[PDB]
């Protein structure tokens, strides 16, 4: 597990470091209905809405 994800370009990285309010992973799920989704940084140190893809 934990190797199959999709990052969401189209997300505000504000909302992510929301640890208050994260609309990343139940955006995620809403749409793209991903597993639980979560906010990580990439190579160039951004922080994006990587989505979990693999079950239900």
Not at 15 to 35: E, G, T, V, W
Not at 43 to 56: G, P, T
């Given at each position: 597990?934990?190797?199959?994800?999709?990052?969401?370009?189209?997300?505000?990285?504000?909302?992510?470091?929301?640890?208050?309010?994260?609309?990343?992973?139940?955006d995620c799920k809403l749409d793209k209905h991903?597993?639980?989704?979560?906010?990580?940084?990439?190579?160039?140190?951004?922080?994006?809405?990587?989505?979990?893809?693999?079950?239900?």
């Amino acid at each position: 597990q934990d190797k199959c994800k999709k990052v969401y370009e189209n997300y505000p990285v504000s909302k992510c470091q929301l640890r208050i309010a994260n609309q990343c992973n139940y955006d995620c799920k809403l749409d793209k209905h991903a597993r639980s989704g979560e906010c990580f940084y990439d190579e160039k140190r951004n922080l994006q809405c990587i989505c979990d893809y693999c079950e239900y």
